[PDB]
Each structure stands twice: as C-alpha cells, then as structure tokens.
C-alpha cells in the first residue's frame, strides 16, 4: 500500500491523457479488442434493434506507464481508474439508439511492462436488417461494427483477440440460439488517401429463433 501509493503518485505526476501513448509519433498504437457476449437481452424486429450485454476487453501498451518492480517492493500490477489514462475511442458504428461509446469507466489493470487491460461492460443496441418472411422459424445474421471514431489505421491499429467472440460466460437466451459467431477485421481505402487505411472489427452472430412459443400461442 505504501509502495503502491508511491508508485501511483509517481506514474501520474506528469501523465497526459490527450496524446497517444507512443514513444515516437510515427509509431502506431496497437490495440487488441475482444468481445465477450454475456447475454442476448432482446431482439426487436419492429424497430430492427438487437440489445446485448457485453464486456469489451481492450489491451494495449502505454509507453509511459512502465516501472521497475524492485523499486516498489515487488509490485507487479495495480488497478487504476480508467478516466486518468488515454484510451482508444471505440465506437459502435451501427448504434441504433443506445450509447455509441463506453460509459461505465471501470478500473484498468496495469502491469509493470506497461501492458493495460480494460474490460468495461456495455449494453449495445445495434441496428441490423431483420428478415421476417419465415417468422417464427427465421434466423438473423446481426452484427456489431466497432472502430476508433477519430483515429485512422495509421495511428491506432486494432486487432481482434480471436477470430471468434468469447461465449464462455454467455447466458442461454430463452428465445434465440446462437448458431455461430465470428469476428472479421476490415481495412477500407479511400480516394483521398492511398496511404492511410481505415480499420474496423465487425463481429457477427448468426442466431436462430426457438419457435415453440409462437407454435403454441399463435399457430
């Protein structure tokens, strides 16, 4: 506690959360992004909105937040308020009517190597096309396009943690079964700028309805 108090005071005495945490402005901050789907809260076919409970793990190295553990009694990791540090501004591009960005600023785990792990919770109300023709026996391919809103791919590169979303903590929905899921990183190019790519990670879930209820109560 005494060691960690000293450490936190010394880390944040001159920290700036405005500029990117690189040593050289020509370097790219590389952010690993992992989506954990905790619960599929709702599907709204009328307004075409999918409500999901997620944990959005982000990992990156902050150059200025290194320390030597032997200076601080063997403290190898600390927990700090995430409002103090620079963070990537991941935005849900296909937000329907929820929050575009993270709003629950939980604690960041910071390691002596400067590696930061942040795992904020979120509720995503994404917008996706709903195909109702076969209802109730339909299946929906609905997606979440995540990307840095104001940084382009030449200054902050985002990489998916795994080719699939994390479903280990997923609570079983009572009306929809996730047939499959997958995350793809994309790198769009524009006619202004042959050099700078624009990056996004689109997670998608193919979910199938459990029709039994509509069989009993309607059919």
């Amino acid at each position: 506690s005494e060691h960690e108090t000293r450490l936190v005071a010394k880390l944040f005495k001159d920290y700036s959360s405005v500029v990117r945490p690189v040593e050289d402005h020509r370097q790219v901050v590389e952010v690993t992004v992992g989506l954990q789907l905790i619960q599929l809260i709702n599907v709204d076919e009328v307004n075409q909105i999918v409500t999901t409970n997620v944990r959005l793990k982000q990992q990156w190295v902050d150059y200025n937040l290194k320390w030597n553990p032997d200076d601080y009694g063997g403290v190898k990791k600390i927990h700090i308020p995430s409002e103090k540090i620079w963070r990537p501004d991941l935005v849900l591009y296909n937000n329907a009517d929820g929050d575009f960005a993270i709003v629950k600023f939980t604690k960041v785990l910071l390691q002596y190597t400067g590696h930061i792990t942040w795992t904020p919770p979120a509720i995503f109300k994404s917008y996706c096309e709903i195909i109702v023709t076969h209802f109730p026996f339909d299946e929906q391919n609905c997606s979440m396009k995540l990307g840095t809103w104001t940084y382009d791919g030449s200054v902050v590169a985002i990489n998916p943690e795994s080719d699939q979303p994390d479903l280990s903590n997923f609570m079983e929905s009572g009306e929809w079964v996730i047939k499959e899921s997958r995350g793809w990183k994309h790198s769009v190019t524009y006619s202004c700028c042959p050099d700078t790519p624009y990056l996004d990670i689109t997670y998608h879930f193919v979910m199938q309805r459990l029709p039994l209820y509509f069989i009993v109560n309607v059919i």
Partner: antibody
Framework: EVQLQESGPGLVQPSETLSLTCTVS????????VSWLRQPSGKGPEWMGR???????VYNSGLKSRLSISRDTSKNQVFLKMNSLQTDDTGTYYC??????????????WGQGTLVTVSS | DIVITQSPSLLSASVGDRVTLTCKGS??????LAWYQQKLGEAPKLLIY???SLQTGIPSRFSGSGSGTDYTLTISSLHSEDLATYYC????????FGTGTKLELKR
C-alpha cells in the same frame, strides 16, 4: 556541484553492526532520491536499497531484514545501518543520486566509495 | 532478473582508435541500458543512458546503440584519458550489472 561523500568504518567485526553515512552537497534530499550500491570483492556491483525523496525507503529483497536506511534533511545526511555482517559483505560501498523519468529510475551520480572489510 | 554479459573481458587498444564494447542480456532490455566508466580510486561516472542519451558534459566521443538483447558502446577516437573499466547495467527489471570491460592501452 553534485557531491556525495560516503564515509564510515573500514574494519568491522562479524555479527556486529555497520554504520555508513553519505553526506550530500549541491542538491536537496527533499527532491532527489539516494540509493546504496555494494560491490563485493571479486564480484560485480549490486543494488541494496533507496531512500526516497519523500522520506520512504525500499530495500533489496535479499537484504530486507538486515538493512535500515534513514535520512536527516536538516544537514543533508543519509545513513545506512546493517546487522549480522559476515565475511561475504566485504567490498566497496557507494551512495548514488538517482534520476527519474515518470516511474523509472537509474543511477546518475556516485560517491567515491568506502571500502568495508568484515574480519576479526 | 536479467543477466548481463560483457565482451571482450579485456581490450588492448591504442590512442586514437575507434573501439566498440558489447553487452548482451538474457532477456529483452527494451533500451533501458546505461553505460558508466570507472577508474581506480575514482567515483563512477555515467556515460550513456537509455542506450543513446549522452550524460551532460560527457565528451562527444562516446555513443551508444543497440536493441533487443544486444547493445554496444563506441568511442570514435580513443583518448589516453579513456583507459578504464566500462560497465553496462539495466534498470528495467531489477538492477543488474555486467562484469565490466577493462579497456587498456596497447603495448
């Protein structure tokens, strides 16, 4: 400008205590950390501990139980007391002034070093 | 902690020669390497820190370089005053020092 006069007894008996004093000139202990290095005879240097500018201390984990470091800002002195001395503790002792960048420290200035020999 | 080795252990050189000393770690030191010079009966003096930054007031002869686990210190033109022991050390995970390189006059 910066000077660190390390001093103390040359010969020490086993199992008794050793006292060393580093007197600082050219800077204030309230704004620079001081650290103690040891160079055993026939071996490379090793770091023992640091007196922080804020008045705290930290020690090498292997020497945590045997070492005490303290300071007096009124006359710019830093003191090292060590117990349970053995023949293996013979060597040259340096006090150093440390630079910082954020939470990273390195040894920037050294004292002239005092030879301490443990013998009977 | 990171183990450090220095080479050569002794180096015979003549005044005016360019000379290079090598320091190698057991793990990535991430440029947190420093070089300091020691003479007999003299207080150690820091030469280089963070692999490149000259200590204030040090002659421009000394220049450092390296990456990963391998680092070097170079003297462009060896003066007679530079015959001494050179230590590399790291300050990123613990504090560990090399065995020293004793740069000595050719004969």
């Amino acid at each position: 400008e910066v000077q660190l006069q390390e001093s103390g007894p040359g010969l020490v008996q086993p199992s008794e205590t050793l006292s060393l004093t580093c007197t600082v000139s050219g800077f204030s202990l309230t704004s620079y950390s001081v650290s103690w290095l040891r160079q055993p005879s026939g071996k490379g240097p090793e770091w023992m501990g640091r007196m922080w500018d804020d008045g705290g201390t930290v020690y090498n984990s292997g020497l945590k139980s045997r070492l005490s470091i303290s300071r007096d800002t009124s006359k710019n002195q830093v003191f090292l007391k060590m117990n349970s001395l053995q023949t293996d503790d013979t060597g040259t002792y340096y006090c150093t002034r440390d630079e910082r960048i954020r939470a990273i420290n390195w040894f920037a200035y050294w004292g002239q070093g005092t030879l301490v020999t443990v013998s009977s | 902690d990171i183990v450090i080795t220095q080479s050569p252990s002794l180096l015979s050189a003549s005044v005016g020669d360019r000379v290079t000393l090598t320091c190698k770690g057991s793990q990535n030191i991430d440029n947190y390497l420093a070089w300091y010079q020691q003479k007999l009966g003299e207080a150690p003096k820091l030469l280089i820190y963070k692999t490149n930054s000259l200590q204030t007031g040090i002659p421009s002869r000394f220049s450092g370089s390296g990456s990963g686990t391998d680092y070097t210190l170079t003297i462009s033109s060896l003066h007679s005053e530079d015959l001494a022991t050179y230590y590399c050390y790291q300050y990123i995970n613990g504090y560990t020092f090399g065995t020293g390189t004793k740069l000595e006059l050719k004969r």
